[model samples]
Target: HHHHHENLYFQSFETATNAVKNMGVGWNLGNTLDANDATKTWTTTVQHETCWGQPVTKPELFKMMKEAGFGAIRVPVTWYQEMDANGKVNEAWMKRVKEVVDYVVAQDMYCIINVHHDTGADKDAFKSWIKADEANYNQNKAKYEYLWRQIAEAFKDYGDKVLFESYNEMLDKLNSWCFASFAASGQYDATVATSAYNAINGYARSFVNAVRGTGGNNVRRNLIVNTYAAANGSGNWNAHLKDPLSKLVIPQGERDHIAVQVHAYPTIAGKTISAIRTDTRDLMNGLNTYFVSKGIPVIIGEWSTSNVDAKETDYDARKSLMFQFVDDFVAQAKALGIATFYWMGLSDGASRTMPSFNQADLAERIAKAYHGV
Candidate 1:
């Protein structure tokens, strides 16, 4: 048996197919999972609020996901929000979290919980702790360890179906990569971006080590790690993944079930599907040829195509996905042995302007593809 946080990753083609037959929908609970600011600079302190997703999440949202083509639910939680000044996670938050997780597990579908919104914050912020600054190169690993101790201690007993995402888009933000999010920050350093990439991978390694220390069958739970978008999405994450990131000279544990995830945002507002697919192909090459070539599994953790608009508007309903884009994307990924979750469910407010893909037509297509129907 694998004696680490590694489990044989399973996606129920059968159950997912059946659920899709029933016109199921999947969802991504966004905003609540990350801290955000509309300011154009990094000097702003991070603030938490129920901005977009309100009642579309948590227990009620999980049920909606079940009804949607969602046999799996990804709950992206910002780790910083529930932590103390010393980085200790809040107990009340943990309990409330369990309430949500329990509801999902009770429903008998795959559930993922991950560190979110820790990406852009103060130096000591949960997301920032894993970042590389003058202080981070040393503290990032320790902070990661402490953070996992709290997280793993809380959910360590969850069965194989309970997935742990190492982090969400854990690299430097791409200002031009998407719209209305991570817009150009002059201080967004390429070096710092690479450093954050290193820190994220190191955290995954440490997380496996820390959680495995619990020793009560926690070692074999599947872990999800994200490669830099440049590496997996923009076709150049090599600097982040080619070398080991941790400082300690520990045993290189042979863990096979650990899977790396890459987000596949085809196009933001004002981009053509053809243009986006070119980059999508490059991103896929990196994930399949680069990451998977080294024997790691990759999933498209996030994906979507949007209609270009002024401001954050999902108008021009006729402009989303176009005709064969979604089908082509699904086909390419399936052909490549990649799994995917198509970004936020509008029911949960992941789309500020993108219309909801929560309906029977999309579900039938997904089900057929998943089951070879």
Candidate 2:
């Protein structure tokens, strides 16, 4: 160990305020590692990642993203596939994760890893162990703690460029989407609503404590806590949209090291440019009202305009509206110091394996929105 270089990427910011300012733009490694289904069986752990229709991750793929102008990568990992009954992640699985993580970190780009799929898809026997419902807290919290502790310990030595997000898209027991089922009219069920927030805070608290307990660079490493269900809480359609944001309890952590993560995938097929910008601004306003105004930073952990209008506005001449949406959102996000991460498959699986982007223009538009490259 002759010398370790400075992690100029994220470490440049002592707090998340500047952290987001410098985060530039990020991309998610979606469906690749986050894909999960309890009913299907696979021959090996490697099959778990490939079973979802993505090929083995290649270093060249990351190189393509880096060269394309991504400053960060969010590596979503679903650990339950190889987790034992006692909440232990298999050594092979953990090692494999490290290998993929290093591929991004080697480029000196920022990286985020989180508990994915483990908080979603609650079928009868296949219900994910972690839930926002309070009734399941104690039972699930134990397993949750074990996973984070293991993960935190594994990456405890890494520099600030590596961040740990609590969970991904966690819904209520009713599998609520827009808002927790406890309140639809934004009227009552105050107890259940309160409980859901408590559960979220509880999980978040555990996440921070577990990571910090590792007692290394992780003590000050940036941590991202998603709003309830990772919701942005922006919409006139639902009075409940803002509830999650207002009810959220910022978990205690080292000063300026925690941030909020949200996602955006509004339907752009049937809408006009002005309407889309208004809607996008609506979301940004809500975030600014709650977190950003208070000096907390936000990250769109996963996002992509829905493909409903893809065929219509996909080609060079027809791509005007779509590209404009990309440009506007990225510009707004940049102004607010909000680091937006595009969900994967923009380049598509085969194209990614080809180690080349299929939608090169869109990638470039997004990068140019926030990145110098």
Candidate 3:
């Protein structure tokens, strides 16, 4: 019976897919750690965290989310400003992140930490953490690997409740929306598409390798990788668009330890409810077909009604439409085994301080939609 006991314990271990499903509905800690000010060069992590004007994150917010039925929190961090020339993250910055992360984990909620706003393409100025091309990936490969290594080592002891998302909306020159574009010219080139797709895949692979090699809880911790631009409307639901994520393959022997992430926000100011539902459903179906059907899990890393547009002149009209979409989207996504994280900076407030909301009704609507209350 000793062998049988071992088998039982192994079977009880959580798989990545099950962990993601348990993650349920989530919210993004937006415009905080990921915020940056282009006008001034940031010298400290605190400046970057609050640059966009969000107050310092309070641990009580996690408790609020827990009581509100949220099962996960996506903490986006802009680590570029905190890293030195050698790509070592500042000790204070790491500790601050860990403190916030511990708050969520203490509430027994899943926490997703990602490298945010650290990648893009602009030759004239300071470049981003990633660029689309073999040469660019190779050139930045050392820095990228080193960054992940530091992150992995720091959180290696954390349990699977803490997942590492590899990036946030890494883009190329195409900058396509609902369809592939060539170098911002709104045209598709097979060659350019292939190169861009391959570059993202390379980064994803490196991230997986770096974390898994750290040898701790990270060895099998769930990791998330995103498609080019993370544009679900363009890359997933848009049949006319080429698959920009075709090359984002799971690392060798990593199977269900990694998941694909995509963002969806189909609620335009003038869009009809029917059109919104159709588009949202199409995106969810596409993810299931491309990722879930292949034994991989998927995460809606970011989604919202208006992508946090506060000056929404017709707030009531927008909220009404948003409620309809959120109800349908969350129900359908949950059914398909894909978890979602709502971008709620606008509903909660641009600053996202606890104990109050800019629009409490909207917040309730979102929570009710996700919780089926």
Top candidate on lDDT is 2
Candidate 2 vs 3: which has more TM-score? 2
Assess the local accuracy of residue 77 in candidate 1 as a C-alpha lDDT between 0 and 100. 74
Q: Provide the lDDT at 77 for model 2.
A: 93
Whichever of 1 and 3 has more TM-score, that candidate is 3
Off by over 4 Å in 1: 1-26, 33-53, 56-60, 121-129, 132-134, 172-197, 229-231, 235-251, 268-279, 306-320, 349-372
- List the global CA lDDT of all models: 0.53, 0.81, 0.76
Per-model TM-score, in order, reads 0.70, 0.91, 0.89
- Candidate 3 lDDT at 262 equals 85
The residue-by-residue lDDT of candidate 1 on 160-214, one tens digit each, is 6577776664434332232111223553445555454455556667767777676
What is the lDDT ranking, best to worst? 2, 3, 1
Which candidate, 2 or 3, would have the higher lDDT against the true structure? 2
Measured by TM-score, the strongest candidate is 2
